[PDB]
Design a protein around this ligand. Structure first.
Ligand SMILES: [Zn+2]
Ligand SMILES: [Zn+2]
Length: 91
């Protein structure tokens, strides 16, 4: 077991933080506040508004989708990444 973000291990595996959104494990320093990792927290803040998502860095959109186990290998334009983020939004 290691942190999905920084790759580090835990001094006590029982203290690893599981993100409620992507469900991966993270450091306390790699998560915040509904315990969420920093990226999932950042995306929730956008309220999943297309315009706000479009302003996000390509790497963040790609990484966020990867954390949610969604492939972006067939995407050629940034808008496709945004559409995938919108598609997996919880309702
Ligand atoms: Zn997460
Ligand atoms: Zn970490």
């Amino acid at each position: 077991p290691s942190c999905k973000s920084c790759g580090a291990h835990f001094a006590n595996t029982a203290r690893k933080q599981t993100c409620l959104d992507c469900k991966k494990n993270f450091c306390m320093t790699c998560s915040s506040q509904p315990r969420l990792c920093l990226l999932c927290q950042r995306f929730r803040a956008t309220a999943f508004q297309r315009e706000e998502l479009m302003k996000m860095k390509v790497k963040d959109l790609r990484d966020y989708l990867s954390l949610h186990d969604i492939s972006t290998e067939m995407c050629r334009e940034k808008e496709e990444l945004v559409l995938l983020v919108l598609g997996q939004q919880p309702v």
